[PDB]
Design an enzyme around this catalytic site. Structure first.
Site, mmCIF file in Angstrom:
data_model
loop_
_atom_site.group_PDB
_atom_site.id
_atom_site.type_symbol
_atom_site.label_atom_id
_atom_site.label_comp_id
_atom_site.label_asym_id
_atom_site.label_seq_id
_atom_site.Cartn_x
_atom_site.Cartn_y
_atom_site.Cartn_z
ATOM 1 N N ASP A 13 -44.589 -7.222 -37.436
ATOM 2 C CA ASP A 13 -43.970 -7.867 -38.584
ATOM 3 C C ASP A 13 -43.376 -6.811 -39.506
ATOM 4 O O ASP A 13 -44.098 -5.984 -40.063
ATOM 5 C CB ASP A 13 -44.988 -8.730 -39.332
ATOM 6 C CG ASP A 13 -44.337 -9.677 -40.324
ATOM 7 O OD1 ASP A 13 -43.094 -9.802 -40.312
ATOM 8 O OD2 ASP A 13 -45.072 -10.305 -41.114
ATOM 9 N N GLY B 296 -50.951 -8.452 -32.379
ATOM 10 C CA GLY B 296 -50.377 -9.551 -31.627
ATOM 11 C C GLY B 296 -48.865 -9.458 -31.590
ATOM 12 O O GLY B 296 -48.227 -9.890 -30.631
ATOM 13 N N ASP B 297 -48.292 -8.886 -32.644
ATOM 14 C CA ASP B 297 -46.850 -8.703 -32.738
ATOM 15 C C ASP B 297 -46.520 -7.636 -33.773
ATOM 16 O O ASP B 297 -47.413 -6.969 -34.293
ATOM 17 C CB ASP B 297 -46.156 -10.023 -33.095
ATOM 18 C CG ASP B 297 -46.784 -10.715 -34.295
ATOM 19 O OD1 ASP B 297 -47.420 -10.033 -35.128
ATOM 20 O OD2 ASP B 297 -46.635 -11.949 -34.408
ATOM 21 N N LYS C 57 -72.034 -32.464 -31.990
ATOM 22 C CA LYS C 57 -71.503 -31.830 -30.790
ATOM 23 C C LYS C 57 -72.300 -30.586 -30.424
ATOM 24 O O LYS C 57 -72.548 -30.323 -29.248
ATOM 25 C CB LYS C 57 -70.026 -31.484 -30.986
ATOM 26 C CG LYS C 57 -69.115 -32.703 -31.009
ATOM 27 C CD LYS C 57 -67.698 -32.333 -31.406
ATOM 28 C CE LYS C 57 -66.710 -33.392 -30.946
ATOM 29 N NZ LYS C 57 -66.995 -34.716 -31.556
#
Ligand code: NA
Ligand code: NA
Length: 327
Positions: A186, A183-184, A66
DNA sequence: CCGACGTCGCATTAGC
DNA sequence: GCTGATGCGA
DNA sequence: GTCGG
């Protein structure tokens, strides 16, 4: 190594990865492409051929092919085709809604539901999680600047201590490692009264408090040990509102806490090496405990852990700050 | 050549 | 109803 | 899809 170096290849592989997970439902092909994408992303030369790339661990015969097609034509025939496919592209996109995985996305698209508009047209067919994911679709895909994470941490630590000053909370993830964005959020939670041998509301009381001060706005899932939900910082007076953010809170027994803190601090690559280190020292580390083997290979009792460094001591390694835990 | 590839808490639905 | 599998996110 | 036993 920079973006423009092999970005066309890594973007190609990441796209292929997503279609495997979301459309083909082949989770291991998904991880294979990502592993290839990762190792190429770190490779410090502009790849000239698929054969050159095949030397890298995680790049095999098919991806080398590829890459050769991409280098010669600037595109992949198969990726061009599947992009152009209305059914597949819609299934892939719908999975970007939190709560909509490969299976739910397939069903929606099967019955003509293909866009966010279609989703908003058909609320009755969405579960609680998916409606929340739909509602905050844009917000959930935004990064969280470290400054906002610090403000969020201020609130979490403050309210947790107010509920019970004997609680122990730690914001882990890439934030604890000192990343400039997240991203968040925790959050790992524990209490002296909660051990392995060892209330059913230790987590509930904390969630309830963060809700009372209107920090936590929504709930995705909630049990006795794990909360997954939505939060938002207070609007800084007359100024624009903050985006809604994803926050996870877990209650962990005191004796499994620092193993939990270690694991959910990461990174993955660091964790893997520290579990390889590690066995060669005759120990086995999971997210919960560290245990000795064991000549015939049998795992013994979990060793007592009272800090992060304690785990390091067991396995002959000097303690490394989260700042230095990328690999 | 053929199986592993992370594991688990919670929500939801299956089968009965 | 209950017992368990599955989907989902991490 | 890739690796390895
Ligand atoms: Na290779
Ligand atoms: Na999703």
């Amino acid at each position: 190594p920079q973006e423009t170096l092999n970005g066309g290849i890594t973007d190609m592989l990441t796209e292929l990865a997503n279609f495997e997970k979301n459309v083909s439902q082949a989770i291991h092909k998904y991880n294979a492409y990502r592993k290839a994408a990762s190792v190429i992303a770190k490779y410090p030369h502009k790849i000239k051929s698929g054969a050159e790339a095949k030397k890298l661990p995680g790049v095999g015969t098919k991806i080398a092919e590829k890459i050769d097609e991409f280098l010669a034509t600037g595109k992949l025939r198969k990726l061009e085709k599947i992009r152009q496919d209305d059914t597949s592209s819609s299934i892939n996109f719908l999975t970007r809604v939190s709560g909509i995985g490969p299976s739910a996305a397939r069903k929606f698209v099967d019955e003509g539901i293909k866009t966010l508009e279609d989703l908003r047209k058909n609320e009755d067919k969405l579960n609680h999680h998916q409606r929340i994911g739909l509602k905050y679709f844009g917000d959930f895909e935004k990064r969280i600047p470290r400054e906002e994470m610090l403000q969020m941490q201020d609130i979490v630590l403050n309210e947790v201590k107010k509920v019970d000053s004997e609680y122990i909370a730690t914001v882990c993830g890439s934030f604890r490692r000192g990343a400039e964005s997240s991203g968040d959020m925790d959050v790992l939670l524990t209490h002296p009264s909660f051990t392995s041998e060892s209330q059913p509301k230790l987590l509930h009381q904390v969630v309830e408090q963060l809700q009372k001060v209107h920090f936590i706005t929504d709930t995705l899932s909630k049990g006795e040990t794990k909360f997954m939900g939505v939060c938002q910082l207070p609007s800084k007076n007359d100024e624009k509102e903050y985006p809604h953010r994803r926050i996870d809170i877990r209650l962990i027994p005191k004796d499994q806490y620092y193993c939990g803190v270690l694991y959910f601090t990461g990174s993955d690559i660091f964790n893997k090496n520290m579990r390889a280190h590690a066995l060669e020292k005759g120990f086995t580390i999971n997210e919960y405990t560290i245990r000795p083997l064991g000549v015939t290979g049998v795992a013994g009792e979990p060793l007592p852990v009272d800090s992060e460094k304690d785990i390091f001591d067991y396995i002959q390694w000097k303690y490394r700050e989260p700042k230095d835990r990328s690999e």
